[PDB]
Amino acid sequence: DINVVNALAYEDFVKLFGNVVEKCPLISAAIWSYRPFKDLADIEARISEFIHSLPDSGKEGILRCHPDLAGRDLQSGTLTPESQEEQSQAGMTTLDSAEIVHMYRLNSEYKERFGFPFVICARLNNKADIVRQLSERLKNRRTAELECAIEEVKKICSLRLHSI
C-alpha cells in the first residue's frame, strides 16, 4: 500500500527498503527525500535515477557490495536473507564439488578482469543460464560490462521491492 509507505518515518523506510540494493541502504535512504510516491513504480524510477547519477566509481562500488555467487559468504552462511533466498532459487546452494570449483574459477577470472564481482539477477536465471552469461560477459569490454552489470542490479532491486 503506497499510502502506508508514504507515511513511513525515514528510519522505518530505511529498515524496510534498506537492502533492495545489496548492502547499499544509502540508496533507499536517499530516495525517501522524494516522497510522496505515486506507486512502487515511482520508487523504482527514483532508484534507477539515483544509480545513474553516480560516477562510474559509484556504480562499480555498488557492484563491490555484492557477494559472489556460490562464494565465501554462501559457504559461510553470511549472505543477507535476500541473497540467500535468491542464490538457492538459482541452484547455488546445491552445486556439486565440480560445480563449486568451476564457479570459483569463473568468479576469480571475472573479478581479475573487471575489478568488481560478477552480478546477475539470480531469480531470473538458473544454474546453466548463469554459467552461460558469466562466460559471455567475461568477453565484454569494461564500459559495456559496467552497464550490463548495473542493469542486473536494477532487476534485482525491482524484484526485491516487489517482495516487500
Q: Residue 79, Cα to own-chain centre: how many angstroms?
A: 12
Closest CA to 146 of 112, 118, 109: 118
Catalytic residue numbers? 66
User: According to the annotation, is 148 in a ligand binding site?
Assistant: no
Interface residue with a second copy among 2, 16, 23, 155 (CB under 8 A) is 23
Residue 6: count other Cβ atoms within 10 Å of its Cβ: 14
CA 122 to chain centre: 9
- Residue of 110, 111, 69 lying closest to 93 (CA atoms): 69
Site string for ligand 2AL, 87-106 (x = CB under 6 A): x-------------------
Residue 132 or 142: the one with the smaller Cβ distance to a second copy is 142
Do 51 and 150 form a contact (C-beta atoms < 8 A)?
yes
The option from a second copy, ligand 2AL, none interacting with 37 (CB < 5 to 8 A, set by class) reads none
When binding is defined by CB under 8 A, the residue of 36, 61, 78, 144 that contacts a second copy is 61
CA–CA gap between residue 43 and residue 32 (Å, rounded): 9
Residue 146 in the binding site for a second copy (CB under 8 A): no
Place of cell 533507499: 28
- Binding of residue 24 to ligand 2AL (CB under 6 A): no
Residue from 2, 29, 40, 159 in contact with a second copy (CB under 8 A)? 29
Q: Which residue has the cell 565440480?
A: 98
Binding status of residue 74 toward a second copy by CB under 8 A: no
- Residue 119's binding partner, choosing from ligand 2AL, a second copy, none, with beta-carbon cut-off 5 to 8 A by kind? ligand 2AL
Does residue 83 contact residue 90 with C-beta atoms inside 8 Å? no
30 counts as binding a second copy under rule CB under 8 A:
yes
Could you say whether residue 67 binds ligand 2AL (CB under 6 A)?
Answer: yes
Annotated binding site: 67, 83-87, 118-122
